[PDB]
């Protein structure tokens, strides 16, 4: 049970705004 | 979009509420989700109250109420984690982000019940980050906090040597962990946040099934990462207690928080809106209660009342004589004259005038206690910081050696344990007990009738000492034998509590640290000021030093000081 | 800002294996420029880090030395190169080491390894780690030069405890700025701190982060007694799986097959070392391997007595498709170990058999090109990923606990579930691979590798492979198969296969159910309504069939035919026929998962916005014969509908007619073999069948849903 990983998150792109 | 979540939590709502309602933000972009059910107290009342009050503020309040029933089913009490209890939580939570969504609104922040958010701009800097589950740390009082850094195959704490220097703030900046409860701040704008989900768990779910263990699988199955990060001083939390205590145990760790967010700020103000219930002061079941205080020194007195009823303690106030400012003429017109041969066991120095007002003080309180005939009397400092359930771990003690009793004559509660050994000999049947040793800092300490008598009986008028290096000697334990055979009778009985109740609240070399004594003035001449000692201050803390084989396990502890949950 | 150009990385590699070439690679990946020692001559010195050894590549560096020992503008760097992968880039390489300052810096490991005296005299640090390690260190030619002009030993003694001897001297320390790595900025060691390493991965690289000081190293080594924890790494540092671009090193070093000859030969070898169901399929399958079969040859070893039938049955097929055949019975006597011994050594001996492709026969191969693919890859040890069905067994395992027992790992479940594709690297592999014959000649030349130890074969022989250093392989691009559960086998009956519907759902549903039963199920026709609110569909096959029947004969006691009955509560049958109800053979539970997985589907898609749970209590087996009963008179049935199933061919068997419906006046003329007949039999449907006149039949019934 070793070797944690810090798996790569983006930012996901932004809703568009309502109307 | 602020959602609370409150149960039993009428002694700590209006603190919390009051601390919730100073949020540097413009109030009519905001909202509440107050939904409290199962709760013994009057949390309803208490919560109708403020949320009638300030309904107009706020843009749109809400409201859950479920006051029947008023206990689970399948529980033992009011702090085991019956599934059941799980389950509604989840659901609850479910429902707040469900009714967060439908609103059109950015962000979500969980506050819950005991989180006090004392910084008023927690708000403004979690939201001016850019991260989609980020979540302040709060301080405590030991290890505790709310993240964690590592779960091992089905989700328990497993540190990792890269908590401590988070926890004790040597570094900084957002660090990447897997855990976050409590007070977190979600994101609902970002496309990715929509598949975050409370109570239906992931399909591929493996697990225990505890409520913050749904969570994190859920925020690592959608591919966002929740952030935590502590650029500044942000709250203060409770430690969990165990699974079997009582309604007033909680009450009780709350005001130790309340207690702890006194010791470096003005207090935490509650709330305008609503009022605190106070409560009556006891006497402890004592004779009396000193404190010695200084009257130049203000600002020390007013916390330490401000503590004292916080623990519903009265206090007979006493004046200590200002030893800097008195001369020789009224010095030797009470035959004040200093033992010979004695010089500072540090430094060297003969004498000081700070140390004699406070042996001053100490003798006219011990002849006053004399005069009036006490059975039992407690003494206090100007500089103090209560350890948990102090009034009832000290009342149980003392209850026990009453009814079995001996010869308890300066029975100890806070000191230095400087002869760092093998462990000392515990008094047979009696818990938390031991005898005593040599040790400084007679901070506080439990004067007997019978230990007044006989320490009076010394007559120490030609004999001037630090009353830290002058009480070993009455129990035959000081080190140097010439001082010893400088006395005469050695009849006195001290004892000592192994778990300390009582600390310095500043050390030395340390912020806020103002010494009326030791800086001083010699007993004679005026023209030596000894100045506050910096290098060889000598006095740092008996904490780190003691992280050795001291031991002292042979002890009986009490059921209670047995607290914390996964964490520490 | 020194230039990238004057740095120039020795290493020392006698032979070349593969960890050689892995650090090669990870090392080429930055552009770095290695110059090797020793490339071809004899390790004379000793083991390898067992005890002692290893003073001879000092002298290699000494007489290398002489060539730079004038240069000035040159930093020189020396790794051991059987277990290094290099995780960063020189820039950063050559920034950190000016930052340090210093002249030589060396890596710090927690433990004095060959020493225990000496302890106390290193200075004093109150954080990292304190003592010394000779495997890496980076400075200055000159200081280098200096450093080991002062070598005069034998060629065997120990050489780290020479450095921590000249290291120790306060004067020659501070004359040469002798300095350690004490926080880990450059070296790092995975001994003693194999709890403070995290893989942060990146947009298309993977790097490795010490969070107890926060450093990111550059040479990963994984000294002492860790490289398994060093070849689990070697997947990901520093470019071996990037989570946008598929695999690294994956899809080269690829032979395609070229030539026109015809492809290398092959040495097959199945084994038999358990009662295994579905045996008769797995050796059809054999001969279907896409392989050319005149080089392809065999060898086929049973161990157990009851299999001896089917292999007696199916064997002059494999003797004439295959260029050669030998067989190793029951009577042997042979433990399994000796089993296996004895096909790798007979592969071993004949300098043809280029590979070896042992196979048990626990491994039902779904795809027909595995041979290729597994050849093709051009490794040295490779297996398939067979994946138990909706399960996370499988045949590797993540990582070894101390005990040399399973100890999962933590991508364990992002393998088995395929979210990753390429070929790993793993500690232990069974039940399928393709060794190499090199490697099997002249790199494992021992014989017994199998037996010898009192643990299991499996175990051992993944640990004598280990333990030479040789890679165990394991590619899961493509779907190579499933495993078969074989845990518990009842044996006792006729067809044993029967009750294998609890365990290996898939393969019972690819051999029994009828071919045609998905097309009828998606619904583009084949379902038949030659009457209305009647139904036609195919639901067994002619192996169900016959096996049910030959079964059911086999039990005899045709019971029934009276009209007061024990066989039911009340006791009064409305029409006896001479039937046995399925809870005498005990196909009950069987018959009734049958109904629940595979009827309910097809009506629940017939009768549209019905919802059933296909409960049943009454099911049974009927025969009719000219002599003794003819069919039954008209009547009606208890239960929503029933399903009547045809289990013999008529007219090759028997003649006569199916089932005649009055209040249509609907004949059903002549049943196939395996469909099935659905309709509602409670109140429409008045229904009575045609007697037969000549031979036997046999019908399924199955009243559904009381
Ligand atoms: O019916 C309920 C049950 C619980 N709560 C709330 O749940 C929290 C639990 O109270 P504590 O302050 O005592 O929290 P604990 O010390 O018990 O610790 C908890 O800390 C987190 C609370 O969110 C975790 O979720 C986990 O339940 C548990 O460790 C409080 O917000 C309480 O108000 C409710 O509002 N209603
Ligand atoms: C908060 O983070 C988001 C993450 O995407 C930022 O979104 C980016 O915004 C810029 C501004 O034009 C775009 O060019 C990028 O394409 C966006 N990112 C993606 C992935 O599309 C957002 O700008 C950040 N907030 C602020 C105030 O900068
Ligand atoms: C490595 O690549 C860089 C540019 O990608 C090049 O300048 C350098 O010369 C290469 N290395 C060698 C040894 O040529
Ligand atoms: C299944 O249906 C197809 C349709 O043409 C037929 O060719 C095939 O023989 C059928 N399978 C059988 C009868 O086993
Ligand atoms: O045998 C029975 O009890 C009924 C059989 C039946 O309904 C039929 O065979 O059509
Ligand atoms: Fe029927
Ligand atoms: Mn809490």
Redesign the interface.
């Given at each position: 049970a070793y070797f944690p990983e810090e798996r790569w998150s983006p930012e996901s792109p932004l809703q568009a705004p309502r109307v | 979009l602020i959602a609370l979540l409150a149960r039993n939590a009428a002694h700590a709502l209006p603190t919390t509420l009051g601390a919730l309602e100073r949020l540097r933000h413009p109030r009519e972009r905001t909202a509440l989700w107050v939904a409290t059910d199962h709760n013994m107290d009057n949390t309803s009342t208490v919560l109708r109250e403020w949320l009638v009050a300030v309904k107009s503020l706020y843009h749109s309040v809400e409201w859950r109420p479920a006051e029947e029933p008023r206990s689970y089913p399948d529980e033992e009490g009011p702090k085991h984690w019956s599934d059941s209890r799980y389950e509604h939580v989840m659901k609850l939570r479910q429902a707040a982000l469900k009714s967060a969504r439908d609103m059109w609104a950015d962000y979500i922040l969980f506050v819950d019940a005991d989180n006090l958010i004392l910084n008023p701009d927690t708000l403004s800097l979690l939201i001016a980050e850019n991260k989609t589950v980020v979540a302040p740390m709060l301080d405590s009082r030991a290890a505790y906090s709310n993240f964690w850094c590592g779960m091992t195959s089905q989700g328990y704490y497993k540190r990792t040597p890269a908590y401590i220097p988070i926890r004790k703030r040597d570094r900084r900046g957002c660090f990447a962990v897997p855990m976050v409860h409590s007070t977190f701040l979600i994101d609902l704008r970002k496309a990715a946040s929509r598949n975050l989900a409370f109570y239906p768990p992931h399909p591929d779910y493996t697990w225990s099934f505890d409520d913050i263990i749904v969570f994190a699988f859920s925020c690592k199955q959608a591919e966002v990462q929740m952030y935590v990060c502590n650029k500044e001083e942000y709250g203060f939390l409770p430690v969990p207690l165990r699974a079997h205590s009582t309604l007033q145990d909680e009450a009780e760790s709350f005001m130790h928080v309340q207690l702890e967010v006194m010791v470096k700020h003005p207090p935490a103000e509650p709330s305008r809106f609503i009022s605190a219930p106070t409560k009556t002061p006891d006497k402890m079941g004592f004779d009396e209660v000193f404190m010695i205080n200084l009257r130049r020194r203000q600002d020390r007195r007013e916390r330490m009342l401000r503590a004292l009823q916080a623990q519903e303690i009265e206090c007979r106030l006493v004046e200590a004589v200002d030893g800097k400012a008195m001369n020789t003429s009224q010095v030797e017109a009470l035959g004040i004259q200093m033992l010979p041969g004695y010089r500072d066991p540090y430094h060297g120095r003969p004498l000081t005038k700070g140390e004699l007002g406070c042996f001053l003080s100490h003798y006219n309180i011990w002849k006053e206690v004399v005069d009036r005939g006490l059975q039992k009397s407690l003494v206090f400092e100007d500089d103090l910081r209560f350890e948990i359930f102090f009034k009832r771990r000290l009342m149980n003690l003392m209850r026990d050696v009453e009814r079995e009793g001996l010869d308890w004559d300066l029975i100890y509660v806070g000191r230095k344990r400087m002869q760092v050994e093998h462990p000392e000999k515990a008094v047979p049947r009696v818990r938390n007990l031991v005898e005593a040793d040599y040790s400084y800092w007679t901070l506080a300490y439990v004067i007997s009738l019978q230990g007044a008598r006989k320490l009076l009986a010394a007559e120490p008028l030609s004999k001037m000492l630090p009353v830290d290096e002058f009480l070993p000697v009455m129990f035959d334990k000081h080190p140097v034998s010439e001082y010893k055979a400088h006395f005469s009778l050695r009849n006195l009985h001290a004892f000592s509590v192994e778990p300390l109740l009582i600390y310095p609240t500043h050390y030395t070399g340390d912020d806020g640290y103002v010494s009326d004594t030791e800086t001083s003035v010699v007993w004679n001449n005026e023209h030596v000021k000894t100045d506050w000692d910096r290098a060889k201050s000598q006095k740092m803390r008996e904490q780190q030093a003691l992280s050795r084989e001291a031991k002292n396990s042979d002890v009986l502890q009490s059921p209670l000081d047995s607290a914390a949950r996964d964490e520490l | 800002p020194v230039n990238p150009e004057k740095l120039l990385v020795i290493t020392v590699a006698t032979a070349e294996t593969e960890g050689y070439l892995r650090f090669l690679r990870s090392a080429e990946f930055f552009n770095y420029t290695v110059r090797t020692l020793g490339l071809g001559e004899e390790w004379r010195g000793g083991d390898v880090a067992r005890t002692v050894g290893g003073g001879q590549k000092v002298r290699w560096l000494k007489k290398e030395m002489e060539k730079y020992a004038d240069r000035e503008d040159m930093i020189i760097m020396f790794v051991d190169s059987y277990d290094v992968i290099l995780a960063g880039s020189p820039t950063e390489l050559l920034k950190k080491f000016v930052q340090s300052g210093s002249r030589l810096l060396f890596s710090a490991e927690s433990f004095c390894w060959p020493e225990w005296g000496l302890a106390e005299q290193y200075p004093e640090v109150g954080t990292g780690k304190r003592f010394l390690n000779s495997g890496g260190f980076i400075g200055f030619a000159t200081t280098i030069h200096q450093i080991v002009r002062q070598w005069k030993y034998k060629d065997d003694d120990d050489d780290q405890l020479f450095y921590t001897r000249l290291y120790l001297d306060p004067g020659l320390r501070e004359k040469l700025s002798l300095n350690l790595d004490h926080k880990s900025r450059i070296f790092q060691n995975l001994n003693g701190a194999?709890?403070?390493?995290?893989?942060?991965?990146?947009?298309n690289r993977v790097r490795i982060?010490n969070?107890?000081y926060?450093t990111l190293p550059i040479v990963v080594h994984g000294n002492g007694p860790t490289k398994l924890?060093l070849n689990?790494?070697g997947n990901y540092v520093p470019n071996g799986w990037t989570?946008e671009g598929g695999c690294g090193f994956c899809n080269q070093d690829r032979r395609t097959l070229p030539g026109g000859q015809p492809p290398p030969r092959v040495f097959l070898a199945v084994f038999v070392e358990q009662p295994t169901p579905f045996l008769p399929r797995f050796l059809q399958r054999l001969l279907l391997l896409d392989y050319p079969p005149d080089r392809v040859t065999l060898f086929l070893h049973n161990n157990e007595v009851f299999h001896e039938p089917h292999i007696a049955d199916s064997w002059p097929q494999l003797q004439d498709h295959f260029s050669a055949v030998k067989l190793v019975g029951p009577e042997e006597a042979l433990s399994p170990g000796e089993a296996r011994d004895m096909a790798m050594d007979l592969c071993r001996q004949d300098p043809e058999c280029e590979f070896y492709f042992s196979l048990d026969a626990d491994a039902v191969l779904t795809n027909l090109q595995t041979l290729r693919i597994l050849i093709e890859e051009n490794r040295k040890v490779i297996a398939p990923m067979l994946s138990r069905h909706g399960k996370l067994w499988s045949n590797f395992w993540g990582?070894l606990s101390p005990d040399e027992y399973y100890?999962?790992?933590?991508?364990y479940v992002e393998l088995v579930q395929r979210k990753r594709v390429g070929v790993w690297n793993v500690p232990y592999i069974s039940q399928a691979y393709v060794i190499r014959g090199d490697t099997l000649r002249m790199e494992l030349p021992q014989r017994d590798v199998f037996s010898g130890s009192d643990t299991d074969p499996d175990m051992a022989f993944c640990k004598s492979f280990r333990d030479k250093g040789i890679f165990l392989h394991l590619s899961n691009q493509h779907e190579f198969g499933r495993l078969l559960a074989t845990s518990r086998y009842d044996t006792e009956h006729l067809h044993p296969d029967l009750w294998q519907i609890f365990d290996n759902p898939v393969d019972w549903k690819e051999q029994y159910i009828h071919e045609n039963y998905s097309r009828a199920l998606e619904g583009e026709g084949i379902v038949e309504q030659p009457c209305p609110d009647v139904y036609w569909f195919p639901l067994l096959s002619e192996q169900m069939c016959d096996e049910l029947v030959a079964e059911m004969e086999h039990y005899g006691q045709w019971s029934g035919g009276r009209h007061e009955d024990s066989r039911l509560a009340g006791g009064y049958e409305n029409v006896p026929t001479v039937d046995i109800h399925m809870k005498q053979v005990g196909y009950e539970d069987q018959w009734l998962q049958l109904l629940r997985t595979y009827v309910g589907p097809m009506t629940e898609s017939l009768f549209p916005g019905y919802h059933t749970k296909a409960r049943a209590v009454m099911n049974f087996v009927v025969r009719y014969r000219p002599d003794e009963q003819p069919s039954l008179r008209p009547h009606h049935d208890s239960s929503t509908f029933t399903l009547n199933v045809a289990l013999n061919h008529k007219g090759l068997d028997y003649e006569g007619g199916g089932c005649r419906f009055l209040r249509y006046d609907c004949v059903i003329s002549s049943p196939r073999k395996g469909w099935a007949l659905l309709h509602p039999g409670r109140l429409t449907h008045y229904h009575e069948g045609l007697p037969t006149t000549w031979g036997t039949r046999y019908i399924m019934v199955s009243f559904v849903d009381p």
């Open positions: - | - | 194999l709890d403070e390493v995290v893989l942060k991965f990146d947009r982060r969070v107890a926060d924890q689990y790494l989570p990582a100890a999962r790992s933590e991508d």
